[PDB]
C-alpha cells in the first residue's frame, strides 16, 4: 500500500515473501537455493 508524504516522500506498507522450495551431483551447487524469507513492515523513502 503506497502513498505520498511531505516533501514528496513515498511511504509504503509492505508484506513481502520470497524464496525457493527445498529440492536436494552439484545440482544444489548450481541452482540458486536461497532459502525462504518473509518480512512485514512499513517504511518511507525520499
Amino acid at each position: 500500500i503506497p502513498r505520498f508524504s511531505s516533501r514528496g516522500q513515498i511511504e509504503m506498507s509492505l508484506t513481502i515473501e520470497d524464496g525457493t522450495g527445498n529440492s536436494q551431483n552439484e545440482n544444489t551447487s548450481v541452482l540458486p537455493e536461497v532459502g525462504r524469507t518473509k518480512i512485514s513492515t512499513i517504511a518511507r523513502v525520499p
Binding site: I1, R3, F4, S5, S6, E11, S13, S40
Partner: peptide, 27 residues
C-alpha cells in the same frame, strides 16, 4: 454556523490497521 471541511493527512494512514504478533493481535 456550520462548516464542512476536507483535511489531508500526510504522515499517517487513516483506516485502522491490524498486525499479527503470533498470538497477540494488535489493532
Amino acid at each position: 454556523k456550520v462548516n464542512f471541511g476536507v483535511i489531508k493527512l500526510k504522515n499517517t494512514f487513516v483506516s485502522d490497521r491490524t498486525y499479527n504478533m503470533r498470538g497477540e493481535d494488535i489493532v
